């Protein structure tokens, strides 16, 4: 019953303070939230994905507390600082809790190159993280994910010691972190790369859970070795996210994502020799076959035949634009029949009336 | 143009979006004047694929 809402929503707002790249970033984060809801991975209110707009100004964008992922729009998100204070009040009139942002802020304090941080709480990811041994390279998606790090999570990152203990365990160059008994976190320089890593890790974790449950132990898995595996240009996740934005736009969703490679739709046509070429490059009129010309008296007006030897005009047109022009519009029908009776019964009564006489005869009398 | 996307189950977004796109975009667009251009055997295989 039309649950869809426009993701862009920048048209309706007409308010607040935004940077030049703020529109694209807000559309990207809201489209990510919609895609997380629409895959069915996450459904309730939390702070899953966080973004960095400016590298030298912080001002991270987070989701307000109490909004489902289907109801996320671009204007409703909240821009904050590194510490977590609300520097920009969101459009949504909801109470603001910025507690879960703190872990993302610690990861932001660790790496300068990270811009997108995605957290997952799906059942398969949590089952993998709760498992004692690490994620096994038993799937092609897990091989494509790459390296990873494991960190024990106590559920709170308010303490300074926990923040300074995360930094060395995360590593200088690492893309995938696993919070034990809590899920997975993916770090991306771009939003699309982080989304790609999230999707591949997500598929790989149900693959590993299903294979591990059905097989029994590790021996039957015959796991592979990661070491033996080892326009302009695309950057890891451009094509997939572009296709997703294209199809979402075809749903009627308004996404602010612009396309590096736009799409051309042409039916085209096959020429057939049997087909013949296209080969292209009220008023009633009364005609008069002659034309009369006015000639001065040789005063009395005179009109002239002007025959065809003198190159006269051929056809004179007379145009009638309406019917019944010959008859006046306003007329009583009884009058004509009355006058017919008046004229006729003088025959019946046989008058002695004579015609009119000219006045030249009257003068001499 | 109000495509009227179908409602989805909590685990069934893929199915609902797929049938909405099936309602919007037909899979056999060759019908009409364009059906002559392709071969009779080839067009049927394209539709099946």
């Amino acid at each position: 019953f039309s649950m869809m809402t426009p993701i862009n929503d920048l048209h309706t707002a007409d308010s607040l303070n935004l940077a030049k790249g703020e529109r694209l970033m807000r559309c990207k984060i809201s489209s990510v939230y919609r895609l997380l809801d629409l895959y069915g991975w996450a459904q309730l209110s939390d702070t899953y994905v966080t973004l960095r707009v400016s590298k030298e100004q912080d001002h991270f964008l987070i989701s307000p507390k109490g909004v489902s992922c289907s109801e996320v729009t671009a204007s409703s998100l909240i821009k904050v600082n590194i510490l977590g204070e609300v520097v920009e009040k969101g459009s949504s009139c909801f109470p603001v809790d910025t507690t879960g942002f703190c872990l993302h802020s610690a990861i932001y304090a660790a790496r300068p190159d990270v811009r997108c941080i995605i957290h997952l709480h799906t059942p398969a990811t949590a089952a993998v993280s709760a498992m004692k041994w690490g994620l096994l390279p038993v799937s092609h998606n897990a091989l494509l994910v790459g390296d990873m790090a494991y960190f024990d999570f106590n559920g709170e990152m308010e303490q300074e010691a926990d923040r300074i203990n995360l930094q060395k365990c995360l590593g200088p160059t690492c893309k995938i972190l696993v919070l034990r008994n809590h899920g997975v976190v993916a770090l991306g320089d771009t939003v699309e790369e982080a989304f790609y890593k999230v999707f591949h890790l997500q598929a790989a974790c149900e693959i590993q859970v299903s294979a591990l449950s059905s097989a029994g132990g590790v021996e039957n898995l015959i796991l592979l070795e990661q070491e033996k595996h080892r326009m302009q240009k695309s950057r890891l996740g451009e094509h997939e996210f572009e296709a997703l934005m294209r199809m979402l736009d075809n749903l009627g969703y308004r996404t602010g994502y612009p396309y590096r490679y736009p799409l051309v739709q042409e039916k085209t046509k096959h020429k057939s020799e049997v087909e013949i070429p296209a080969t292209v490059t009220k008023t009633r009129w009364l005609n008069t076959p002659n034309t009369y010309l006015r000639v001065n008296v040789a005063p009395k007006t005179t009109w002239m035949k002007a025959d065809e030897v003198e190159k006269s005009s051929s056809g004179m047109p007379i145009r009638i634009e309406n019917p019944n022009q010959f008859v006046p519009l306003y007329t009583d029908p009884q009058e004509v029949l009355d006058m017919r009776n008046k004229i006729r019964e003088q025959n019946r009564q046989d008058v002695k009336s004579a015609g009119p006489q000219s006045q030249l005869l009257a003068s001499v009398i | 143009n109000v495509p009227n996307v179908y409602p989805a189950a909590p685990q069934g977004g893929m199915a609902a979006l797929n049938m909405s796109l099936g309602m919007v975009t037909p899979v056999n667009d060759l019908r009409g004047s364009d059906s002559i251009a392709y071969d009779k055997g080839e067009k049927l295989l394209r539709c099946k694929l």
């Binding site: 057939s272 049997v274 | 002559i36 071969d39």
Partner: peptide, 18 residues
């Protein structure tokens, strides 16, 4: 191509009429 396309088309008027 055109000849055997009308071949087929007349085939489906036979199929379709009765």
């Amino acid at each position: 191509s055109f000849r055997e396309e009308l071949e087929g088309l007349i085939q489906e008027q036979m199929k379709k009429g009765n």
